[PDB]
């Protein structure tokens, strides 16, 4: 399922990161030059593939939404914070000087006695931290976490021990606030990244909820799991009786006592249930009375991917203004609108993008998302309160 990378140990420059096999085998901490060049991607746009037929030129232009990424200012901060909380979560879990063997020995009692606060050692602390990500839908919470966590090898294998360190794991919450289906998504996502059978032996034996909350966090320490990511934490709002608080108590006992870092993602509708929090917003055209440099760069880098024969290199201010007007800042809407306009231009035969064409494409093919964009356009808090997720 996942490729096992044999570990080679570098020389870290931090006193605390002294002799851990876990954090001296991770890729080196990048710098500001590599915080904005290890994420960039764009379509090739070969000049040989512009004179081809309409069908080829219309199938090769739909790959823009998947293969285009431009790191903004917020991604730098997110990458730095994830790096810190994934490198600092192992110092209290040293496997050399008998510190991880003191975290696995305690966790056997919690499986036996069923209580998640029965320490056997008092000298084994926890050093993990927590993060909370909240932003409007379409802001980029997942596709900018699958390119910032994609520079780490996931399953690593250390042969000095027999440990198979899983650097990061990603699961998502149940469609309701279920109790035994959050501790089963963990197993279903852990045994398809290792090729093992953990779901078929943890859960099929008719266990209670407490035993399945203890076995999950014990097997998350048998493999030195570095970061646990839970997507769509807003699914706990419609929980069962007491599920909206028992799981949020577990998610603060896991980072504080057991020591596994945890990161949570949700739409601003998930602020009601409540952890350092990061808030994301759609790009604003005006920052200090002048057009935003990030927005200008985003637009002028997207405009250089065009398969239309009668393309215009120069981007008009009116075209940019109407693009922002019809998009209202959400990057998903921006990219999708550009792609749809390009496809409709190829279909008609007129191969130059116009403001009128943009408006027609919007009005004809963005019907469901109309009221949310209009609410954000109006900017009245009373209209914003219903939908638009801002």
């Amino acid at each position: 399922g996942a490729t096992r990378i044999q570990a080679v140990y570098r020389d870290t420059g931090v006193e605390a990161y002294r002799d851990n096999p876990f954090i001296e085998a991770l890729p080196p901490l990048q710098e500001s030059v590599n915080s904005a060049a290890s994420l960039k991607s764009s379509l090739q746009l070969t000049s040989s593939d512009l004179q081809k037929s309409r069908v080829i030129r219309a199938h090769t232009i739909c790959r823009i939404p998947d293969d285009y990424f431009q790191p903004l200012g917020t991604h730098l901060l997110l990458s730095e914070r994830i790096s810190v909380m994934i490198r600092g979560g192992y110092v209290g879990r040293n496997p050399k000087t008998g510190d991880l063997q003191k975290h696995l020995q305690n966790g056997y009692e919690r499986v036996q006695t069923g209580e998640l606060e029965t320490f056997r050692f008092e000298e084994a602390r926890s050093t993990a931290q927590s993060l909370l990500l909240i932003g409007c839908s379409g802001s980029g919470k997942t596709t900018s976490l699958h390119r910032i966590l994609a520079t780490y090898p996931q399953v690593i294998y250390h042969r000095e021990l027999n440990v198979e360190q899983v650097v990061y794991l990603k699961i998502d919450c149940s469609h309701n606030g279920s109790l035994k289906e959050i501790c089963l998504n963990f197993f279903r996502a852990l045994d398809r990244a290792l090729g093992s059978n953990y779901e078929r032996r943890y859960g099929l034996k008719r266990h209670g909820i407490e035993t399945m909350l203890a076995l999950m966090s014990q097997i998350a320490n048998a493999h030195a799991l570095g970061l646990l990511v839970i997507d769509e934490i807003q699914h706990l709002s419609r929980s069962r009786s007491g599920g909206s608080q028992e799981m949020l108590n577990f998610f603060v006992t896991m980072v504080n006592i057991i020591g596994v870092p945890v990161m949570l993602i949700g739409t601003p509708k998930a602020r009601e249930i409540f952890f350092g929090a990061i808030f994301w917003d759609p790009i604003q055209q005006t920052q200090r009375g002048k057009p935003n440099q990030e927005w200008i760069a985003f637009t002028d880098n997207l405009w250089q991917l065009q398969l239309l024969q009668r393309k215009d290199a120069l981007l008009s201010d009116e075209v940019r203004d109407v693009w922002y007007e019809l998009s209202q800042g959400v990057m998903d809407i921006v990219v999708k609108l550009f792609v749809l306009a390009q496809l409709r231009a190829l279909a008609l035969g007129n191969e130059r993008i116009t403001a009128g064409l943009l408006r027609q494409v919007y009005q004809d093919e963005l019907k469901p998302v109309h009221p949310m964009l209009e609410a954000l356009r109006s900017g009245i808090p009373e209209r914003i309160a219903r939908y638009s997720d801002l």
């Binding site: 000087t97 008998g98 510190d99 063997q101 003191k102 696995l104 020995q105 966790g107 056997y108 499986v111 036996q112 056997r120 294998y157 042969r159 021990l161 027999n162 440990v163 198979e164 290792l194 093992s196 032996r201 034996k205 203890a214 076995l215 014990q218 097997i219 048998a222 493999h223």
Partner: protein, 310 residues
């Protein structure tokens, strides 16, 4: 099993399997046997285990662990190999790989004595503190589980406690420090501790693998040695000087404790049978007493060298 712990330094493989069970929360012994082995008809054995070969396959990715290394360094094989012979030793090594517990025990002498001598768990007060200080865990160790001596080689005495291997025949049990010790005075005999410290280096010695003198070699070696001591009448034993020397070296209470009480009046005895032609391989402990009573200027490895030479 996707993550099998490497054995610590000088450990029994039984403790390794028990810790493998601990590290993943496999409380049910049947589930542990299913996951580690695949069959529910295995016996948890301390000293001369079987089914190695599926244990050495879990550690196959680690280059340094092979079947011979577990057989020699993490099981109590070096205490039987030099004495049984050559063909029996090779057959036993071949049978430790496969799934036969009975044949492995039959090939070896006291393994075929069909009694589990002091099957209760042992531990040493001071050793557990050192292991907690250095490794952070507490494991069973080959030093504690000597075949007949209930004593740690370096410290005084082994503090016993209840429960045993045969109470549950399909469960591996791992020591927890919460039962660290109980403070009650116990004193150990000096010569018995000396015997433990004399026999301990045989465990950690590479030369014990290939030095297994044959039966006629043993009897001829003892015959010439007894002739050199000068206590040997023409094709006869004095039966008095040897008893006097062993009684001076080891007291009566010791011989009671290790279950080799002398019967000089009885013609058949553990000490008497050594002088005559050897019929079957004698236990390591009898040879240890003979060596320590006769000549203390040579170690166990030196004695093995002298026996193997001629």
């Amino acid at each position: 099993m996707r993550n099998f712990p490497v054995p610590y330094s000088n450990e029994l493989i039984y403790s390794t399997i028990a810790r493998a069970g601990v590290y993943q929360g496999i409380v049910s012994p049947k589930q542990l046997l299913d996951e580690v082995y695949g069959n529910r008809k295995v016996v948890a054995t301390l000293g001369l285990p079987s089914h190695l070969g599926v244990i050495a396959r879990h550690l196959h990715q680690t280059g340094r662990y092979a079947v011979q290394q577990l057989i020699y360094e993490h099981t109590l094989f070096p205490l039987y190999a030099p004495f049984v012979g050559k063909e029996r030793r090779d057959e036993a090594i071949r049978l430790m790989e496969y799934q036969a517990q009975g044949a492995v025990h039959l090939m070896l002498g006291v393994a075929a004595s069909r009694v589990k001598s002091d099957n209760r768990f042992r531990y040493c007060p001071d050793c557990v503190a050192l292991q907690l200080n250095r490794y952070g865990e507490a494991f069973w160790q080959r030093d504690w589980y000597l075949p007949a001596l209930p004593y740690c080689p370096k410290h005084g005495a082994l503090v016993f406690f209840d429960r045993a291997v045969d109470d549950h025949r399909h469960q591996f049990w791992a020591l927890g420090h919460t039962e660290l010790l109980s403070d009650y005075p116990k004193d150990s005999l000096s010569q018995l501790t000396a015997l433990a410290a004399y026999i301990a280096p045989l465990l950690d010695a590479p030369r014990a693998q290939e030095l297994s003198p044959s039966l006629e070699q043993w009897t001829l070696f003892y015959q010439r040695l007894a002739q050199d001591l000068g206590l040997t009448k023409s094709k006869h034993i004095r039966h008095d000087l040897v008893a006097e020397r062993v009684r001076q070296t080891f007291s009566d209470e010791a011989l009671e404790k290790l279950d080799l009480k002398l019967a000089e009046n009885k013609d058949t005895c553990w000490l008497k049978s050594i002088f005559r032609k050897h019929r079957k391989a004698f236990s390591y402990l009898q040879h240890s007493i003979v060596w320590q009573a006769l000549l203390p200027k040579l170690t166990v490895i030196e004695a093995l060298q002298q026996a193997s030479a001629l």
